[PDB]
Amino acid sequence: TWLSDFPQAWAETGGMGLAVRQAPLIIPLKATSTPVSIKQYPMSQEARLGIKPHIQRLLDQGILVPCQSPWNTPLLPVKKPGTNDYRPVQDLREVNKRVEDIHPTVPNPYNLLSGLPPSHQWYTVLDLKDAFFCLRLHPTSQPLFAFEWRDPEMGISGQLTWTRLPQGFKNSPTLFDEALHRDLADFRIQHPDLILLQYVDDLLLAATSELDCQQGTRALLQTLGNLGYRASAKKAQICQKQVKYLGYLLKEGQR
Amino acid sequence: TWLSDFPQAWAETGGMGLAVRQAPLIIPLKATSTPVSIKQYPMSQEARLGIKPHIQRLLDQGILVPCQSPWNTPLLPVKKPGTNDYRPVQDLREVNKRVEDIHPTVPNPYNLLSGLPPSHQWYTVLDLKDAFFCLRLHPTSQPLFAFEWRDPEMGISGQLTWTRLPQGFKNSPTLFDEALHRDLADFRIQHPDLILLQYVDDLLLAATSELDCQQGTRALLQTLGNLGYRASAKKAQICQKQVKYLGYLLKEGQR
DNA sequence: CTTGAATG
DNA sequence: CATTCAAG
DNA sequence: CTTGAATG
DNA sequence: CATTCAAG
Ligand SMILES: N=C(N)c1ccc(Oc2ccc(-c3nc4cc(C(=N)N)ccc4[nH]3)cc2)cc1
Ligand SMILES: N=C(N)c1ccc(Oc2ccc(-c3nc4cc(C(=N)N)ccc4[nH]3)cc2)cc1
């Protein structure tokens, strides 16, 4: 009943996250960058109706807010199964090109897994839901990610932008990984015997026994919830001898 | 009047050459080679009539002879200006593939020219006419180069082959260059002060003065004629301060 | 004419 | 993968 | 829909 | 140089 013991740590019961200890992120531009405003290609009504619910939800959550900005990038309608199930995908390539590069600090899965001792075979895998959205963007950097939004007949003035780290931004994975490392530094210190692997929003906790794993998981969930992050209860793999992590199947200490 | 003083050395007056000091060449095949007989693609009457005179001339010269061989490669009709001026071109690629490779001993023009001292600025350039044809092919190797020949209505039985080193054969340049080097070895020894460069059928004689060049040229022409080779009187550049050799313009010792 | 390599 | 070039 | 890279 | 893939 981990779902009930840690209501705040799960996406299904704690609501949208917000990393309260992390200062709003400022995104430095390259020395010669000037705003670029790309025209929004006309979107069919089908695509707009498919996207609308997502946009409204983000607006209600305060993740998207109205704005007037010199920057503008196109929104794209992306589906998968049939001509249904849409979801907003912003093409931030022209923005990415104008943002100063940062060093890629996220380890590749292969090297990350090398830090898992055979002594720790009790695993717990958690994936953080809407991880990037948990990190606030400083108001000065918000205008950079603006896009146009029109309702199938009459909607908001013109542009909308993100108040949190957006999908499609080249530095989101690295900035998120670095932010969570800062937030989980104390947890690591308070649990010397535990092994914690972080790959952006995918976490692997390893303990020597089933007890230390349940104790560790309880503490990690409590810490994450308190910090403002949210894990997927649905996909969560708690205290298992075998788990799926980063495309690998961890079993008998293999891999 | 070099044309009259050396009748035997010029192609225009000495007739078709024949390297009398060189033993008929035997062409070794690769260890696993077996004869290949490629069908002759039908040739238009236009092409056949264009080729016929050349074939008859070679037959009269004994350069081509009738034969029955397990080997056969295609003859091609090649023209240049208009739909006129034809000339037989044999595709010996399938034969080349089955012949043992030999080391490429012909120097590249750049390196060959490095052996020309500034002290020798009186040049003479001669190109040997139908050079390969001057080298006999041993009867055992003649069948290898056979091709089919049909007259525009009624001609020779079937196949014809070469009795001399043929054009299109991968080793002809090297074998010719090596043969002429053997034949001109004594000339080099008898004329220590002369510079002689050989690039297959293109010869460059260099002397310190105009006299040594005329003396040297006279001796070279006499030697070549006696050996059975023939130079082009038309293209000959005798005792000049400036000459064209291997695409270069030799002048003032430059190049 | 058929082959291979070099370009679009 | 379709054309162009080069070559025998 | 637009971009670049990878394939034919 | 025309298609296909991948991605934002
Ligand atoms: N698809 C198309 N419309 C086109 C595709 C390619 C085009 O141009 C060219 C095609 C081929 C060459 C070219 N091909 C070769 C082959 C060589 C060899 N291997 N002997 C040696 C040198 C050489 N140059 C040069 C230019 C023109 C049009
Ligand atoms: N001209 C034609 N008829 C055809 C030409 C090419 C064909 O196939 C293919 C085309 C393209 C790919 C292919 N393209 C990419 C791009 C990648 C990237 N840069 N992100 C990463 C991986 C990748 N695989 C794989 C196969 C099929 C037909």
Side-chain angles (χ1 to χ4, degrees), chain A residues 41 76 93 97:
Chain A
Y41 9 107
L76 297 61
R93 288 176 297 179
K97 290 179 176 177

Side-chain angles (χ1 to χ4, degrees), chain B:
Chain B
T1 59
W2 305 74
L3 193 169
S4 57
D5 293 304
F6 301 109
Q8 198 191 210
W10 302 112
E12 295 92 321
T13 55
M16 181 56 67
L18 189 178
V20 303
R21 311 273 266 275
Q22 292 303 308
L25 300 173
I26 292 174
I27 306 301
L29 300 185
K30 290 179 176 179
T32 65
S33 299
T34 180
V36 55
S37 183
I38 305 172
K39 240 296 182 179
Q40 170 65 57
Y41 9 107
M43 189 178 285
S44 67
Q45 177 178 281
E46 173 174 282
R48 183 171 308 98
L49 277 48
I51 288 176
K52 186 176 179 181
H54 301 82
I55 300 302
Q56 187 58 242
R57 171 170 41 50
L58 292 167
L59 282 168
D60 296 334
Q61 284 172 155
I63 296 185
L64 280 179
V65 294
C67 81
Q68 193 173 306
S69 172
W71 298 84
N72 199 79
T73 39
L75 207 61
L76 297 61
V78 180
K79 70 180 191 301
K80 296 300 177 61
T83 182
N84 299 58
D85 62 288
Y86 279 77
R87 61 186 182 68
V89 174
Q90 184 172 14
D91 180 359
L92 288 173
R93 288 176 297 179
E94 285 303 305
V95 163
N96 288 331
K97 290 179 176 177
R98 294 171 170 72
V99 169
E100 184 73 12
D101 296 308
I102 62 175
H103 189 67
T105 59
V106 181
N108 53 64
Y110 190 100
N111 294 319
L112 180 66
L113 275 296
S114 69
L116 208 185
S119 50
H120 299 64
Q121 295 190 182
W122 285 88
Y123 315 112
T124 284
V125 171
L126 300 171
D127 61 281
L128 305 179
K129 186 66 179 303
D130 298 306
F132 299 165
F133 292 165
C134 290
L135 300 184
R136 294 168 290 175
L137 265 183
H138 185 104
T140 303
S141 295
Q142 285 173 23
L144 180 62
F145 305 101
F147 58 92
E148 177 182 301
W149 182 247
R150 305 272 48 180
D151 185 283
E153 62 87 9
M154 168 50 236
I156 309 177
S157 296
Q159 293 170 297
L160 294 181
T161 200
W162 308 89
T163 65
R164 310 295 182 83
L165 194 56
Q167 295 294 314
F169 172 46
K170 73 176 177 185
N171 293 341
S172 290
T174 298
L175 294 175
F176 180 83
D177 197 59
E178 291 178 7
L180 186 63
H181 267 293
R182 293 192 292 278
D183 279 342
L184 296 182
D186 182 60
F187 173 94
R188 288 174 179 285
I189 291 174
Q190 304 300 167
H191 304 284
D193 299 358
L194 291 179
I195 290 290
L196 176 61
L197 265 42
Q198 302 176 220
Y199 185 72
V200 190
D201 57 6
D202 299 304
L203 316 178
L204 174 66
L205 188 66
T208 297
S209 62
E210 178 174 55
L211 180 59
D212 291 2
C213 191
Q214 65 175 55
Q215 296 183 305
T217 300
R218 292 194 186 76
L220 178 58
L221 284 172
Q222 183 68 199
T223 300
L224 288 166
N226 172 274
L227 290 168
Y229 299 100
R230 303 285 185 271
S232 172
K234 172 59 177 301
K235 303 184 177 184
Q237 300 171 70
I238 305 182
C239 300
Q240 298 294 300
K241 297 265 60 180
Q242 177 182 304
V243 298
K244 292 186 180 60
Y245 186 60
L246 306 183
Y248 292 86
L249 182 62
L250 271 40
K251 176 180 179 178
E252 304 175 4
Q254 288 297 179
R255 293 177 163 187

Side-chain angles (χ1 to χ4, degrees), chain A residues 56-176:
Chain A
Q56 187 58 242
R57 171 170 41 50
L58 292 167
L59 282 168
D60 296 334
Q61 284 172 155
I63 296 185
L64 280 179
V65 294
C67 81
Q68 193 173 306
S69 172
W71 298 84
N72 199 79
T73 39
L75 207 61
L76 297 61
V78 180
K79 70 180 191 301
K80 296 300 177 61
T83 182
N84 299 58
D85 62 288
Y86 279 77
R87 61 186 182 68
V89 174
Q90 184 172 14
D91 180 359
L92 288 173
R93 288 176 297 179
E94 285 303 305
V95 163
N96 288 331
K97 290 179 176 177
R98 294 171 170 72
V99 169
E100 184 73 12
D101 296 308
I102 62 175
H103 189 67
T105 59
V106 181
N108 53 64
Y110 190 100
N111 294 319
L112 180 66
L113 275 296
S114 69
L116 208 185
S119 50
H120 299 64
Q121 295 190 182
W122 285 88
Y123 315 112
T124 284
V125 171
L126 300 171
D127 61 281
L128 305 179
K129 186 66 179 303
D130 298 306
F132 299 165
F133 292 165
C134 290
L135 300 184
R136 294 168 290 175
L137 265 183
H138 185 104
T140 303
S141 295
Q142 285 173 23
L144 180 62
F145 305 101
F147 58 92
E148 177 182 301
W149 182 247
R150 305 272 48 180
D151 185 283
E153 62 87 9
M154 168 50 236
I156 309 177
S157 296
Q159 293 170 297
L160 294 181
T161 200
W162 308 89
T163 65
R164 310 295 182 83
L165 194 56
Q167 295 294 314
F169 172 46
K170 73 176 177 185
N171 293 341
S172 290
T174 298
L175 294 175
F176 180 83

